[PDB]
């Protein structure tokens, strides 16, 4: 299937308690592989996956260089935004950035990203064409004009279709036993009596990778959303994911229900029946 590399950064100002804290993380699909935290002692990009540890010292120097430069830029950007919006210096603000690339199943460039959010709301984003910007408001319009004049779009595009893709391909190969695996969900059902009149059927998906999954309950073949509880997909901590979906059933009507599971690691969707 396709693959992605993403870097996620968060800068949070802390009025009266020093300079903003900056945290960046890098992911290949659902697997984290690097981090940087401006508050940590090391002041270096650090490995967070086994397959990245084989990169040499020049990698670690250059990556540390780039992420430190980012940290400083976003520190400046937090100050610039305050001024644009005329917001009080006494309040904490957050600036988030995301960038990276998708490749298809044989490694060709599919899509690139480069976007910012300020206080949880989209600020500016490189459009899918990698040629123009979407600005969320009048402040981001100023930024948009600046980035237009500076030709930021073409600089980032060169990164996104070049280096981003090359790195993602290299990681996918180096971590192929980890990254190019699919772990199908281990599935089962549990039963939980509520009263003499009702019982809960919970359909489980465990130990799956990647995290993308769909779990659906049906009653007599009819898609059942009414009376279903669905938890957010959660990490197990070991590189795999978990999810469940439950329905409240009239006691004695358990056999009318089917749980349906879709996942990239399954050749065909599964149907589970109690």
């Amino acid at each position: 299937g396709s693959h992605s590399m993403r870097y996620f950064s968060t800068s949070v100002s802390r009025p009266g308690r020093g300079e903003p804290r900056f945290i960046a993380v890098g992911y290949v699909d659902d697997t984290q592989f690097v981090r940087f935290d401006s508050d940590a002692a090391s002041q270096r990009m650090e490995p967070r996956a086994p397959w990245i540890e084989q990169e040499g010292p020049e990698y670690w120097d250059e990556e540390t260089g780039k992420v430190k430069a980012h940290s400083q830029t976003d520190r400046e950007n937090l100050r610039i935004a305050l001024r644009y919006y005329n917001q009080s210096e006494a309040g904490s603000h957050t600036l988030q950035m995301m960038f990276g690339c998708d490749v298809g199943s044989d490694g060709r460039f599919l899509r690139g990203y480069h976007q910012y959010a300020y206080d949880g709301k989209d600020y500016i984003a490189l459009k899918e064409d990698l040629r123009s910007w979407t600005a969320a408001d009048m402040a981001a319009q100023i930024t948009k004009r600046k980035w237009e004049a500076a030709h930021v779009a073409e600089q980032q595009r060169a990164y996104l279709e070049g280096t981003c893709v090359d790195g993602l391909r290299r990681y996918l190969e180096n971590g192929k036993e980890t990254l190019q695996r699919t772990d199908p969900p281990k599935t089962h059902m549990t039963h939980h009596p509520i009263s003499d009149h009702e019982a809960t059927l919970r359909c489980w998906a465990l130990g799956f990778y990647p995290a993308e999954i769909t779990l659906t309950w049906q009653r007599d073949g009819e898609d059942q959303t009414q009376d279903t509880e669905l938890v957010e997909t959660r990490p197990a901590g070991d590189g795999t994911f978990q999810k469940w979906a439950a329905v409240v059933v009239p006691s004695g009507e358990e056999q009318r229900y089917t749980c349906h599971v879709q996942h990239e690691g399954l050749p065909k969707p599964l149907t589970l029946r109690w």
Partner: peptide, 10 residues
């Protein structure tokens, strides 16, 4: 691989 510089401010 991280995005290179230079960064351009807001």
């Amino acid at each position: 691989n991280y995005t290179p510089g230079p960064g351009t401010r807001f």
